[PDB]
């Protein structure tokens, strides 16, 4: 019977992957089609490498014979995205983990209220959020310019406030870990910091990966806030940079699609690297019961 389920699973997964990959293959197709066209065959009739050439830093020899150098530094935009998403992801993990630990293991007044509040206030549709943020970062810039307008620090600093859900997520996971491990830690003389760092985090490593992954993705794909704070072309992230390809009456689809595909590269890599922390059985053998 176990052979029957496995083959069926393989069959249904492949069919399911085929379906969900189809839209993405059409994006890849757009990026290899000559000119800028949103529709066409899966394998484009007229193939072109120019969209990728320009995206990768290559100049292009076009019909009339003159050389077209790359209008934009796409790879630099990609690096900027990795930097902003990477540093902000670390910051978010570090901030929400410590928060979670308190909520999950410590007594203090208005704790239930704070968690209700964190959840509820992040649900607010702040339609005028950009107006508020611009004003904050404009003033902040006069005093700490390292985190003001037109800085990566600023973009990163802005993302560090999006932790409420991550705090709930990590909290919940901490609560699956039997507390006697930390109790025994305490009796061995461990401070709450030491029990947190040396006992709990090592066993919580799967959810730390989840939070890093979710935060990286969020940051790599973010437009409005980065677009609002970043001014200089050489500081743009990729998500902001590729907005240059969109105009009121037409889109440079080919260039935009190639940018969209490049943006999936750092995410795929981080997802792969994150798997070493996604392991079962971390608590096995600790607690009888």
């Amino acid at each position: 019977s176990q052979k029957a389920r496995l083959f069926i699973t393989h069959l249904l997964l492949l069919l399911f992957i085929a379906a969900i990959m189809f839209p993405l293959l059409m994006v890849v197709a757009i990026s290899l089609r000559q000119g800028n066209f949103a529709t066409g065959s899966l394998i484009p009739e007229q193939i072109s490498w120019d969209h990728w050439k320009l995206a990768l830093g290559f100049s292009v020899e076009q019909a009339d014979g003159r050389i077209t150098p790359p209008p934009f530094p796409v790879l630099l935009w990609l690096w900027n995205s990795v930097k902003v998403a990477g540093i902000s992801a670390i910051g978010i993990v570090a901030l929400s983990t410590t928060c979670a630990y308190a909520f999950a293991r410590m007594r203090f007044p208005g704790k239930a209220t704070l968690l209700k509040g964190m959840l509820i206030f992040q649900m607010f549709p702040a339609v005028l959020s950009l107006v508020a943020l611009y004003a904050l970062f404009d003033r902040l810039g006069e005093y700490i310019p390292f985190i003001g307008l037109n800085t990566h620090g600023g973009v990163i600093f802005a993302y560090l406030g999006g932790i409420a859900l991550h705090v709930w997520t990590i909290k919940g996971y901490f609560e699956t870990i039997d507390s006697s491990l930390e109790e025994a830690a305490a009796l061995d003389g461990a401070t709450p910091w030491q029990a947190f760092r040396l006992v709990l985090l090592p066993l919580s490593v799967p959810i730390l990966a989840v939070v890093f992954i979710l935060s990286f993705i969020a940051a790599i794909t973010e437009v409005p806030v980065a677009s609002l704070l970043l001014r200089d072309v050489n500081s743009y992230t990729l998500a902001v940079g590729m907005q240059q390809y969109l105009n009121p009456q037409n889109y440079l689809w080919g260039d935009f699609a190639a940018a969209a595909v490049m943006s999936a590269l750092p995410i795929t890599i981080v997802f792969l690297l994150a798997q070493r922390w996604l392991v079962n059985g971390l608590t096995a053998g600790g607690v009888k019961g």
Binding site: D178, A184, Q194, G281, G285, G286
Partner: protein
């Protein structure tokens, strides 16, 4: 440090698992807690270590009121009933964890981890993680972790329960030597009567959240204060059978056995609040029943069960006008069949007697080995 509990009460809402508990564990005392599974032995340990809150009353360690002190600051170590091993760390790392938090020399950590590991017979398992150990090995890891820490107050919660007999004996001894070397307070919870009898300076018997009795091992065995303690200390348990008081003296009680023949026996037991005609419970241990040939007071009946333990034979006998069977122990292997008629002797010096309320009429026969 000394440990004292003054009117300690513990309630999980309306359920009360500790009632006005008063104990006084002196400096360097080895105290064993025994009692039925579910009675509150672990709860007492957890309240002392600071892992469970105290509903009311006062806990003192080394003369300091510790009710609100954090666990890390009580001078307490514990071998958890559930072991509570660090599953991400090896045996060595489990055993050396506490010493690393204190900034101990690496050589000092390796010296005394190897020392504890050798006696526990875990030396070849130092690299293993808890998941890759047997149930009894895990337990020994939990023992060795607390041994290395050498706290001022040792709590052991059923620390030998998953070990072979031969090894249990070897661990009994090491714990006993440790207490003699360090002279520090040890509070040891066990269901094993031999551990209790050989380790304890003093045994605390619990019963549904109350302290039923406290005393030296031989004190509880020979002189249980009531029926419950009498039925709990010593296994196979003491036999009980209803009797009727026929006459009294200041230092003895005459009772009529329930058999058709109404045999009367004087017991060397007090007659305080013991009235003629009252229904009592006569306790006699399986080990204390004698062969029939060398006996005055005879009880005869039909054999119901025979357990051959090799060293001895335990024989359960059904005796007319007594609902419960009589359990008898005899040295060596004895060939008996179910249904056979068996007689045993009932020695009056070694009979306990319990009032309607369950309280013991104190025995006045003097047993060698108790003050």
């Amino acid at each position: 440090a000394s440990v004292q509990l003054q009117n300690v009460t513990k309630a999980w809402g309306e359920v009360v698992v500790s009632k006005d508990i008063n104990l006084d564990i002196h400096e360097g005392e080895f105290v064993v807690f025994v009692g039925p599974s579910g009675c509150g032995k672990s709860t007492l340990l957890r309240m002392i270590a600071g892992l469970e809150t105290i509903t009311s009353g006062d806990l003192f360690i080394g003369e300091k009121r510790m009710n609100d002190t954090p666990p890390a600051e009580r001078g307490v170590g514990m071998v958890f009933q559930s072991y509570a091993l660090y599953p991400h760390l090896s045996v060595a790392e489990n055993m050396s964890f506490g010493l690393k938090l204190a900034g101990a020399k690496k050589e000092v950590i390796n010296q005394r981890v190897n020392q504890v590991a050798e006696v526990l017979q875990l030396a070849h398992l130092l690299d293993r993680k808890p998941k890759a150990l047997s149930g009894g090995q895990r337990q020994r890891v939990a023992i060795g972790r607390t041994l290395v820490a050498e706290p001022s107050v040792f709590l052991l919660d059923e620390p030998l329960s998953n070990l072979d007999a031969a090894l249990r004996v070897q661990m009994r001894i090491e714990i006993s030597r440790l207490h003699k070397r360090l002279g520090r307070t040890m509070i040891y919870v066990t269901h094993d009567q031999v551990e209790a009898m050989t380790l304890a300076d003093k045994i605390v018997v619990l019963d549904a959240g109350r302290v039923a009795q406290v005393g030296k091992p031989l004190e509880l065995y020979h002189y249980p204060a009531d029926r419950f303690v009498a039925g709990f200390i010593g296994s196979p348990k003491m036999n009980f059978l209803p009797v009727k008081v026929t006459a009294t003296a200041i230092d003895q009680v005459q009772v009529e056995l329930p058999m058709p023949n109404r045999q009367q026996v004087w017991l060397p037991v007090e007659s305080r609040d013991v009235q003629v005609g009252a229904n009592m419970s006569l306790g006699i241990r399986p080990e204390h029943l004698l062969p029939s040939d060398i006996a005055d007071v005879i009880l005869e009946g039909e054999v119901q069960v025979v357990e051959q333990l090799g060293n001895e034979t335990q024989i359960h006998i059904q005796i007319p006008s007594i609902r419960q069977n009589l359990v008898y122990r005899q040295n060596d292997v004895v060939l008996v069949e179910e249904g056979a008629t068996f007689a045993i002797g009932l020695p009056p010096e070694r009979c306990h007697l319990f009032r309607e309320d369950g309280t013991a009429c104190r025995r006045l026969h003097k047993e060698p080995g108790v003050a």
